[PDB]
Structure formats: C-alpha cells, structure tokens
Amino acid sequence: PALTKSQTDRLEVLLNPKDEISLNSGKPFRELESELLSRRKKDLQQIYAEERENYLGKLEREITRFFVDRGFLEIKSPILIPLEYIERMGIDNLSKQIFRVDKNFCLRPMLAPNLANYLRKLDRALPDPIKIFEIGPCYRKESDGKEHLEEFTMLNFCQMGSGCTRENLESIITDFLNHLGIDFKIVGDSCMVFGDTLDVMHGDLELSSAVVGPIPLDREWGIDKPWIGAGFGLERLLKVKHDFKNIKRAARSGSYYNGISTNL
C-alpha cells in the first residue's frame, strides 16, 4: 500500500476539496486513480451540460456588476504598459518581479498606475466623487508556492474626492466581501509603494491591500485630492470560496478547468 511520490502527485491533481477520499486510505493507486478519474469526468460533464461558465470569468462578471451598481465606472486599461510607470510608482530598480517586454515596456504588476491616470483625467469631467474600478490580468515573477501566481487577476477599486475616509473604505470592503460570503479581518501593515496599508485577511491569507490617501506619491501622478482604494486577487478569492489547497487550481491554465484537472 505504499505509493510513490509520482503516484501521490497524480492523485493530488485528481483530488478535489469536496472528495471525502484519503490517498492514505490503504486502497491501491489503480483504484484511487480510477475512482478520481471517474469523479472528475462526471464533474466536467456536468459543467458542460449545465452552466459552461469559467470561474474566473464568472467572478469577474459578478464583481463588475457589484461595482457598477454602486456607482463605479468600469475601466479596461492596457496590460502592456511603459516601463517608466514602474520607476514613477516609486519602485526603485518588486522591480525584480517585473516581466519586461522589449526595452521600454513591461507587463503591469498592478492596476494602480493606470487607475491613477484615470482618476486625474476623469476629475476634469465628472462630478465629485470620482469612483472607478478595473479587473484584469497582472504579472509578477514569484517564488511561488500555494498563494502566488505569476499571472493573476486583480480587482482594484478606488474613489477620489469626498467620502475618501478609512471608515468608507472599510465599509466598501465589508459590503463587497459580505456579497461574496467571505469572512475576513483587517490588520495594519506597510508596503513600499503606498506606505501604510490596511490588509484584508482571511486567516493567514491576504485577500487585499487597501490604502487611505493622500500619500506623497500622489504628486508624481497629478493626484491632488483625498482618495481611497483597494486591490484584491481574484484567484485568492476563488481559493477561499472553493477551498482549494493550491492557488494554481484557480489560475488561467490549460491544466485545470474550474479546479478540475484537464488531464483525464
């Protein structure tokens, strides 16, 4: 009844959180693999027959509706951005985590720079307060492990003008995570782009970093009003919602569809 590392890895790929199957049950590999293969095929067949929606896409749509309905403008900004945005976010040569493209471009590691540009520009046209959000891919070179991806999906919402207080920021975070049914706490932390943050924690998992401005970086971006904002990783939200052991189950991938192995 002794399984090799390769056999255990194959079974872990096929195991899903809802299964009440122990790989250490004492059953031989052939029977555990056959059982899990049958369950996962059934799971994919049910998805194909009924809903057909991708978890990341569906969560993006649900989040989009939530923020649009609360008065935030939906932004879709470039993923491929000037490398100069990095230096100007105060990221001195995190900078090592940047995927570079050609000589003067990079894949955005966060949504903040593009959203700062939109806050500044929209403040010339829209009534106070300015409320915007974006959901989309971001990129960082990571270690990684069970909680970091190199290609992940960020939500960042922000507001500039009136109402940009710690209590309003916390209230939006609370309403949002209550909508998703996710328990959390808020702890204070610091990072080097923004200074002090409010970190939104689910256990020992960071779901979001949030900031109450103004901060001295604002001048580099032409921001000259109070502001609040928060960034959330969608794959981390999915990891919590579906109780995935590893965040890769939630990622853009050819190896899992809605957390189900595609190697069947």
Added chain:
Amino acid sequence: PALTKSQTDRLEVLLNPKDEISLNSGKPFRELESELLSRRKKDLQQIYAEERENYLGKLEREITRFFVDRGFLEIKSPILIPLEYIERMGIDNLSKQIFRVDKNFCLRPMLAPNLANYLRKLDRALPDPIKIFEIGPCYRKESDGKEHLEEFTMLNFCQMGSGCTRENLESIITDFLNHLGIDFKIVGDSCMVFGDTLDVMHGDLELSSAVVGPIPLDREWGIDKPWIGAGFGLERLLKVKHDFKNIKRAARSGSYYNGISTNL
C-alpha cells in the same frame, strides 16, 4: 479660418461619429474646441450617471452569453505563453510580430494554440461534439494604422467532432453577427498558419478569419478529428458598431473611454 495640423488633430480627438460638426465649417478653433469639449463632458457625465459599463467589457459579456447559451464552454487560458507554441503553430522564425518576454515566453498573438490544447484534453472527457470559446487579449507588433492595434481582444470559438462542416461554421458566424446587427460577406483567402480561410468582411474590413479543418498542423497539436473555428477582433466589431474612424477609439487605453477622449 485656417487651422494648423495640431489644432485639427485636437479637434479630431474630440470629435465623435454622431456629431454633425465639420472642422472645415469656417468656425475658429476656439469655438469648435469649446463646443466639442462641452459635448464630450456631457457624454462622459451621462455614462457615469447611467450605465457605467466599458464597451470592451460589455461586448465581451454579451459575446460570452451568446456562446455559453449555444453550448460552448467558456475558456480563460494564459496570455503569457511558451515561445515554443509559436514554432509549433508552424510560425517560422508573423514571427517578427511577437512580443517576447524573457527568453522562453511571449505574449500570445492568437488564441488558437491554447484552444487546440483544450480541444485535445476535453475530447478525453466530454461528449461529442466539443464546443469551446475564449475571449481575451492578444498581442502583435503592427504598422499600424486605422485597423490594427498592438494590444487587441480576440474571440475564438471552435468545435471538434461531429457537425464540423463549412455550412455549420457559416451558420454560426451568421447567427453571431446577426445577433450583433453587423452586415457581412464571406470571401476566400489564405494565410500561412491555417492555409485556406473564410474571411468575414464588413466592406473592406476583415472582421474574422475562419477555418474548416482538418489541416496538417493538427498532428503537432494532437488534434485528430474534424474541427471548425473562427477568430474575431472585438475592437473591429466596436469600430463597425460605433462608426469609429480609427480603431484606437475602441482599444484598451487611457486616452479614450467608450470612444470619448479622456483629455478634457
């Protein structure tokens, strides 16, 4: 009444297709600029007050519903892909249009490789026929002009197994563009990745290239069944729908929101 090139460019930025304003009317720049600025601020204020949805995001959601409701599985696959996928799509060192990332990766220039992988894998689990689609960013270095972007958004749908005929492919294209209200014709063309294509044309604008397999490239991807597929550019669909002069009005950008200049 003579406007400089810089003045005309500024007015063209602020002009929208619905305006019945001629820059050559004889009015001075100051009055044309003031009028257009007021119209565009009004337009953005109305968007902010009412719908708040981004054109690219909203079109993606509408397309997603169309294909999900017709039995296609929604895919979200990596944007950052192995450079090896390029060579294996038969793209010999289009290859010059690839944005390279590090030494062994690139930004995907098309959705086909990831979708071929999903067709192959899903054929081991799902009943015939296999029907899938993806919408998302793709990247090519272009010239460019009024119809090409370096960062654009592709829809690619495909089917493998039964029903993979020219007539079914045309029927899906027809139902899809009828749903969007876009007139078109089909013309034969060729490309070097897929061979003969059916090009979906709106006037002299190519909306899609479509392929009826099998093709000899299939073996490199483990595809061994009949298949059909088509790829559409969402920004080109928006250019037609909103009568934009230049495709940049439709792109991910900090310079236009739903075709309205953000420089106000």
